[PDB]
Every structure is written in C-alpha cells, then in structure tokens.
Amino acid sequence: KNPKSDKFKVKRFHHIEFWCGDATNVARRFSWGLGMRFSAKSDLSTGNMVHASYLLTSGDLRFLFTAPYSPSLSAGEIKPTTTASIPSFDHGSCRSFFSSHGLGVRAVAIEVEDAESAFSISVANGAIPSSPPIVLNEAVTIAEVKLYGDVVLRYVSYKAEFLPGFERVEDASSFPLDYGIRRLDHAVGNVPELGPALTYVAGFTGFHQFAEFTESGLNSAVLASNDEMVLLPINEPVHGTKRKSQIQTYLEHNEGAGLQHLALMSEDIFRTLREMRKRSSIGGFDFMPSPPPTYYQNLKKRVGDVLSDDQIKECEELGILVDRDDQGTLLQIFTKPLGDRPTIFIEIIQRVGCMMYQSGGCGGFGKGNFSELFKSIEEYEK
Amino acid sequence: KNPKSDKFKVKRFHHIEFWCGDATNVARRFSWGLGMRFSAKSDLSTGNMVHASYLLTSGDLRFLFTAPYSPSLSAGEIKPTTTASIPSFDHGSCRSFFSSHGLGVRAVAIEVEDAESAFSISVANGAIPSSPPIVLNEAVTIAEVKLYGDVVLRYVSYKAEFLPGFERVEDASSFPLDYGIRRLDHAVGNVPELGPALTYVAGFTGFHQFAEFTESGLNSAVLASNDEMVLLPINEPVHGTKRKSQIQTYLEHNEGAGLQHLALMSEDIFRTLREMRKRSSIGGFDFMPSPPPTYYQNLKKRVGDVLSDDQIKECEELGILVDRDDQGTLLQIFTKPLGDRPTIFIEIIQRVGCMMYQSGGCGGFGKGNFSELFKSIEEYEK
Numbered sequence: 027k028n029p030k031s032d033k034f035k036v037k038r039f040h041h042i043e044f045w046c047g048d049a050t051n052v053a054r055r056f057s058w059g060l061g062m063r064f065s066a067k068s069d070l071s072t073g074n075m076v077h078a079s080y081l082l083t084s085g086d087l088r089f090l091f092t093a094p095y096s097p098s099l100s101a102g103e104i105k106p107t108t109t110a111s112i113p114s115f116d117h118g119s120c121r122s123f124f125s126s127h128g129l130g131v132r133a134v135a136i137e138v139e140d141a142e143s144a145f146s147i148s149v150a151n152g153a154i155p156s157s158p159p160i161v162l163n164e165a166v167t168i169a170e171v172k173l174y175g176d177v178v179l180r181y182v183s184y185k186a187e188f189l190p191g192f193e194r195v196e197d198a199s200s201f202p203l204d205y206g207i208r209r210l211d212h213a214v215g216n217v218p219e220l221g222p223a224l225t226y227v228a229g230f231t232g233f234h235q236f237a238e239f240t241e242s243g244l245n246s247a248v249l250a251s252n253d254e255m256v257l258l259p260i261n262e263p264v265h266g267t268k269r270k271s272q273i274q275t276y277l278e279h280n281e282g283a284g285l286q287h288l289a290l291m292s293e294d295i296f297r298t299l300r301e302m303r304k305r306s307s308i309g310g311f312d313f314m315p316s317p318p319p320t321y322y323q324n325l326k327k328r329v330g331d332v333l334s335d336d337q338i339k340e341c342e343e344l345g346i347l348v349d350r351d352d353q354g355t356l357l358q359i360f361t362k363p364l365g366d367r368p369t370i371f372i373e374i375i376q377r378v379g380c381m382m383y384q385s386g387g388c389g390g391f392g393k394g395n396f397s398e399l400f401k402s403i404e405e406y407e408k
Numbered sequence: 409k410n411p412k413s414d415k416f417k418v419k420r421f422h423h424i425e426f427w428c429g430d431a432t433n434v435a436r437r438f439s440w441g442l443g444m445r446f447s448a449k450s451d452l453s454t455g456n457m458v459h460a461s462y463l464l465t466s467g468d469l470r471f472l473f474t475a476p477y478s479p480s481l482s483a484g485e486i487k488p489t490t491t492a493s494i495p496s497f498d499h500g501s502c503r504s505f506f507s508s509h510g511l512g513v514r515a516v517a518i519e520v521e522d523a524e525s526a527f528s529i530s531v532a533n534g535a536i537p538s539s540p541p542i543v544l545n546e547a548v549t550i551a552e553v554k555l556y557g558d559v560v561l562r563y564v565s566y567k568a569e570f571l572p573g574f575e576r577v578e579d580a581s582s583f584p585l586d587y588g589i590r591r592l593d594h595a596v597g598n599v600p601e602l603g604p605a606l607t608y609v610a611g612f613t614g615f616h617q618f619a620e621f622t623e624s625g626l627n628s629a630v631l632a633s634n635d636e637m638v639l640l641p642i643n644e645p646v647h648g649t650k651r652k653s654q655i656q657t658y659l660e661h662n663e664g665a666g667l668q669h670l671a672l673m674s675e676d677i678f679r680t681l682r683e684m685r686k687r688s689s690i691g692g693f694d695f696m697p698s699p700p701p702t703y704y705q706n707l708k709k710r711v712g713d714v715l716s717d718d719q720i721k722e723c724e725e726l727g728i729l730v731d732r733d734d735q736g737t738l739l740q741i742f743t744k745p746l747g748d749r750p751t752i753f754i755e756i757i758q759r760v761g762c763m764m765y766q767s768g769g770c771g772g773f774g775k776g777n778f779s780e781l782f783k784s785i786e787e788y789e790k
C-alpha cells in the first residue's frame with residue numbers, strides 16, 4: 027500500500043554532495059572510475075574565494091565535490107557579500123565534518139516544487155533546520171534540514187545551469203566519459219537506532235514505508251516519496267551475532283551515523299561493470315569479492331525465466347548479484363569503500379520489470395542476497 | 409666550485425610524502441596521472457589503526473600518501489604501543505597541516521648513511537628538530553628536522569622493503585603502469601625571505617650553493633649535496649613588479665612557506681608527456697598552456713646542435729620547454745597545480761649532456777625560459 031502522504035511536492039533526486047579535503051583529486055578519481063563528465067565548476071577561476079566545487083554528471087546523476095579554501099581568502103566577506111556559490115557552506119562545518127567522518131556525503135539533494143515551502147513544512151513537522159531557504163539570482167532556491175548524523179537533506183527548486191554562480195566546463199577539460207550510469211536509485215543511511223531515525227524522517231517528509239526487513243548484521247526499512255522515485259533506506263546494527271555487524275563497523279570508523287551507500291542505476295549494467303572493472307587497478311574503483319561459482323549455478327533455478335543462460339554467464343564473469351521479489355528482478359554489485367575508511371561504498375544496479383515507465387524500487391534492494399550468498403559460500407567449501 | 413662540505417654522508421632522494429585528507433583518492437589519481445605503480449601499503453589491513461599510507465613507485469621515484477584515521481581507533485595506544493608504521497605521525501599535526509595548507513608535501517626524505525648521526529649533526533648545527541631518530545624493527549632508522557614552513561627534511565638509513573610495517577601490494581591491485589618517470593631530480597621551496605632560508609638549511613646540512621639568480625617574479629638559489637644529486641632550490645618573491653609574483657600568490661594561498669614543485673626525471677620525456685597528456689582530461693594532470701609557435705621557431709637557433717628539427721617538432725607537439733647552460737641542455741614542462749589551490753605543481757624534465765653517469769643539475773633549472781617565453785609571447789602577438 028502507498029498512502030501518498032508527502033507533505034510537499036517532491037520530484038526526483040537532484041544531486042549528491044561530497045565534502046572533501048581536496049575536491050580536485052576526488053572528482054578526478056571519481057570521473058575516471060565511474061565514467062562521469064566534468065560539467066560545471068565554482069572555484070577561484072569563477073570568482074569563488076570560499077570553496078572549490080566540481081560537478082560530475084552521467085545522465086541524470088550529479089555528483090558534487092566541495093572543499094574549503096583557506097579562510098584567509100574570504101576573511102573580509104560577510105554572508106551578504108559572500109563569493110560562495112553555495113550559501114550554506116561553512117569552512118568550519120566542512121573541516122569538522124571531514125576531520126570527524128573522512129570523505130563522505132554531506133548532502134542528499136532532492137528537487138522539489140518549492141524549496142522554501144518544503145523547508146517550512148518540514149521544520150513545522152519536526153525537521154531540525156540546517157540552512158534556511160536562500161534564493162540564488164532570483165532563479166533557484168536552496169534550503170537544508172538534518173537527515174541523520176551530519177548528513178543534510180537538501181531541497182532545491184527552480185523557477186524555470188546547475189546553480190547560479192557555477193560555470194559550464196570548457197569542452198577540452200570536459201572529456202565525454204560515459205560507462206552507462208544514468209541516475210541515483212537510492213541513498214542509504216546507517217544509524218545506531220532505526221526506530222527514532224525512521225520516525226523523524228517520515229515525520230517531517232510524509233514519506234511512507236516502502237519496504238522493511240529484520241543473522242546478517244542489520245535491520246532495515248525504506249522510506250519513499252509519493253511516486254516512490256525518491257528512496258531512502260536506513261539501517262541499524264543487530265548486536266549479538268557471530269560475525270560482526272558491518273553496520274556497527276561503519277558507525278565505529280565513521281564516528282557515528284552517516285550515509286552508507288549510493289545506488290546508481292545503469293542503463294546497461296554489463297557495460298558499466300566491464301568499464302569499471304577494466305579501471306579498478308588504474309585509478310578506478312575496486313569491487314567486493316565475487317560470489318563462488320555455486321551462486322551462479324543456483325541462479326538458473328531462480329531467474330532462468332528472466333535471464334538467458336548467456337546473460338547469467340555474463341553476470342558470473344562480472345561478479346553481478348541477482349535478486350527478485352514478486353514484481354521484478356534486480357541486478358546489483360557493490361564496490362569496496364570509496365576512500366580510506368571502511369564506510370561509504372557504491373552499488374551499481376539495474377532493474378527488470380514493473381513496466382507501466384518503470385516503477386521505483388522494482389525488485390527491491392537485494393536483501394535476499396545475504397542468505398543466498400551465505401548458502402552459495404557454504405556449498406562451495408564442500 | 410664545489411667545496412663538498414656536507415656535514416654528514418647523504419646518498420640520494422628517497423621519497424616524498426604527501427599529507428592528505430583521503431590518501432586513497434589522491435594516490436589513485438596520481439597513479440593514473442603519472443604512471444606509478446601501487447607498491448606498498450600500511451593501513452587497517454596491515455594492522456595500522458593510526459594512519460593510512462600508500463606508496464607509489466616509478467623507477468627510483470617514491471611517492472607516499474598518508475591520511476589520519478579517526479583518533480578513536482587508536483585512543484588506547486601510547487607511542488611505546490603504537491600501531492603506526494611511521495612513528496613521527498601525529499593526528500593533530502596532520503589535520504592542522506592540511507587545514508592550513510591543503511594537499512601538499514609534508515616530507516622531503518633523503519637516504520643517508522646513518523639517520524641518527526645526520527640528525528644529531530644537523531641539530532648541533534642549527535636544525536630545528538621535528539622528530540627524533542627512531543629505529544624500526546632494528547633495520548631502518550628515521551628522523552626529521554624542519555626544512556621550511558611545515559615541510560620537514562626526513563633522514564632515512566638502512567642497516568642492510570620500503571619501511572618495516574609496510575606490506576608489498578597484492579599483484580592484482582599492483583597494475584604495472586610506467587610512463588617513463590625514473591627519479592626525483594629536485595624539490596623546490598617557496599619562502600618569504602630567501603636569505604634566512606638559505607643560511608638555515610646550508611647551515612645544518614653543509615649543502616653548498618649550486619646556482620643562483622635574481623622582472624620574472626622571483627629570486628632563487630639552489631643548495632646541493634657533495635655529488636650534487638640532492639638538489640634543493642628555494643625561491644622568494646620580488647615585490648614591486650607589474651604582473652604579480654607567482655611566489656607571492658603561492659604564499660597567500662598556501663598560508664605561508666612550503667614546497668612549490670617536484671621535478672621528476674624521465675628516461676624518455678617524449679613518451680612521458682604523450683602518456684600524461686592523453687590522460688589529462690580523464691583523471692590525470694593538466695599542463696600549463698603551451699608556448700606559441702614562435703618559441704619553437706626560436707629553438708632551432710638555440711639547440712639545433714643538440715636536437716634535430718624532428719625532435720624539436722616533437723617538443724612543439726608536446727609543449728616541451730628547452731633551456732641550456734654552458735654544459736648541458738634541459739627539456740622541461742610544468743603541470744597545472746596538483747590540487748585545489750594554486751600552490752604545488754610538478755615539473756617533468758630530462759637532461760642532455762654532462763657525461764662522465766650524468767652529473768646532477770646538467771643544464772640548470774630553466775631560468776632562461778622566463779625571458780625566452782616572454783619574448784616568444786610578444787613576437788607571436790605581432
């Protein structure tokens with residue numbers, strides 16, 4: 027059931043902002059590793075004396091990388107005279123975030139009908155404010171509320187090209203990389219206590235419970251917007267098991283709650299994974315260890331109706347996981363952590379089914395692959 | 409004249425250590441951009457709860473990238489029980505360095521006969537101590553003194569594989585990239601006042617003045633070891649010109665003195681620059697704008713005896729600069745800044761001449777290319 031209870035009009039995921047030590051090196055690594063083009067910038071060369079911000083795009087997916095300059099460059103500025111293109115930015119907030127958590131997501135940004143209305147309604151409904159609505163060049167409105175840990179949910183609305191004050195990137199630096207990634211499918215938080223986290227976020231958004239489930243290290247539940255195109259899963263650890271909760275490991279190395287993974291939809295996951303895997307050892311991203319051959323023998327009996335033997339064999343080459351609910355099928359694979367700490371990682375996904383356009387969450391989030399990987403692993407020992 | 413006045417036995421440049429926010433992303437970007445292999449690591453997977461350190465190598469050149477973990481992982485450690493593989497590391501020193509300067513070189517490391525002797529002699533001769541000599545696994549000795557700003561000169565000596573506590577990297581992650589770079593030729597500091605800087609460093613090393621020169625933004629002088637294989641140029645701004653001193657710009661954005669550039673010798677600069685330039689827009693490094701065609705017409709009359717028309721034409725394709733002293737010829741080119749701030753950059757060089765082995769500094773450091781670029785530029789306007 028979908029009660030469609032959004033307290034304001036939400037459209038789609040808009041962008042994800044990483045807070046970095048050096049935005050240049052992170053953005054260049056991500057561009058090559060994921061196949062995203064350099065599409066906009068805001069930095070010293072655009073008149074920004076406050077922060078360096080670089081935007082990568084692939085299809086509709088937008089990754090923003092931001093780092094602070096020396097505060098001395100902007101010492102005479104005040105907020106009414108700022109050269110920052112993102113008015114919520116603060117040197118001290120950014121250095122404290124990064125010192126505490128390391129490289130990770132500061133902002134999960136969604137496009138809404140009216141960011142000022144979304145902000146007021148959210149705070150009137152219990153959201154902790156982080157940055158009030160600010161109108162940029164009377165064209166774009168931006169506002170932020172706390173989501174979990176030091177992650178903010180950022181609202182963006184357009185009257186009628188990323189943000190005012192950003193410049194489109196010079197074609198020579200804009201190499202048109204593309205490995206098939208097209209949009210953000212979901213963004214997942216890790217918290218110490220799921221119940222309060224769910225109550226808080228669902229409280230101020232009106233997002234409804236899309237899915238939920240309770241030996242594998244975690245309990246999880248998913249919040250969704252009215253058309254279930256904005257999907258926000260949240261996990262908590264389950265203490266008292268054998269192998270340690272990876273959620274608990276996350277919370278320890280991250281210094282508390284934060285964003286666990288970004289799932290990126292590919293229009294051709296086979297091509298995406300071939301391209302990403304070619305680059306793993308030359309600057310790109312590494313993938314989690316592949317499942318044993320038993321996992322792929324067992325796939326025939328699970329998705330032989332959806333995937334040819336041929337296509338299953340291609341999953342096995344690439345290490346791709348498959349899961350299925352009563353409506354759709356999910357192809358998924360997970361990177362190793364994106365940076366130094368065992369905290370944030372990326373998931374690549376493609377969904378098959380639920381055609382009407384495709385409905386969001388088609389096939390679920392892969393919770394069946396915990397048990398099926400475990401079984402697959404034991405069968406291969408013997 | 410070379411008075412060979414080293415106060416201790418110095419061998420060669422050993423490594424350069426970058427202090428980073430996230431060592432993983434910087435090291436991966438540099439590996440791809442410069443063609444260096446992942447050759448050793450010290451991190452959580454090797455038992456290091458303190459810092460993440462990744463070593464890239466190309467020939468004899470060694471680049472180390474280090475970032476701190478959360479202090480909470482090592483809260484119960486003391487120095488006698490530390491899991492850090494580099495005992496001089498300090499979480500607070502590293503975060504303060506990076507907050508102040510951004511991405512850059514913390515340590516210029518030279519291999520000496522005996523690091524404890526080098527340290528004692530250096531401090532007895534005026535060096536400000538930074539980290540006392542520490543013996544690692546009774547095999548390697550490490551010590552550090554202040555060089556300029558927050559950059560340390562690090563002494564390393566071996567009894568008889570990078571450092572104890574580092575692990576050689578698993579061949580699958582060790583992709584054998586190589587674009588021809590072979591060793592560090594020189595490492596250059598920017599300071600507010602050259603005189604005191606020179607007196608201090610030459611005071612405690614016994615390094616001698618190798619070169620010096622005084623409209624182009626700077627005054628510079630070069631200190632050298634006995635065999636002139638360790639070369640340490642130092643620049644200061646010249647205030648009172650037309651175009652702003654790039655040294656002054658460095659000091660402003662870096663929050664004071666620090667390392668300006670690393671010059672990396674290539675065994676085939678043509679191949680190095682072809683490989684680096686292919687990767688500029690796909691995660692690698694950008695190069696400074698190329699000189700006009702006039703610069704390359706003027707090359708025939710300057711180095712037509714050393715370089716064929718053919719080889720000069722290849723310099724012009726690649727943007728390579730050429731200079732010459734009375735003993736040798738220098739091919740050189742400069743990257744744009746390595747990170748967010750207009751501070752540190754890299755030079756690629758190859759030297760022709762001074763054969764005996766090749767003597768260090770053969771051809772100089774390219775100071776003639778300031779005037780020759782300027783002239784070249786005016787000739788091309790008209």
Ligand SMILES: Cc1c(C(=O)C2=C(O)CCCC2=O)ccc2c1C(=O)N(CCF)CC(=O)N2C
Binds near residue numbers: 259272373396
């Ligand atoms: C994170 C994750 C998901 C996942 O996407 C998901 C959500 O989107 C929301 C519900 C809860 C949840 O976990 C699905 C499978 C999965 C992992 C996983 O993390 N790991 C550990 C590191 F890779 C190991 C592993 O073997 N499997 C199979």
Ligand SMILES: Cc1c(C(=O)C2=C(O)CCCC2=O)ccc2c1C(=O)N(CCF)CC(=O)N2C
Binds near residue numbers: 696753777
């Ligand atoms: C740094 C540098 C050197 C250089 O290597 C050197 C030493 O090694 C020690 C003596 C002093 C010194 O400057 C040589 C040429 C040069 C630059 C240069 O910095 N720039 C600005 C940014 F690229 C612009 C430019 O046009 N030319 C031609």
Ligand SMILES: [Co+2]
Binds near residue numbers: 214287289373391
């Ligand atoms: Co997921």
Ligand SMILES: [Co+2]
Binds near residue numbers: 594669755
């Ligand atoms: Co130089």
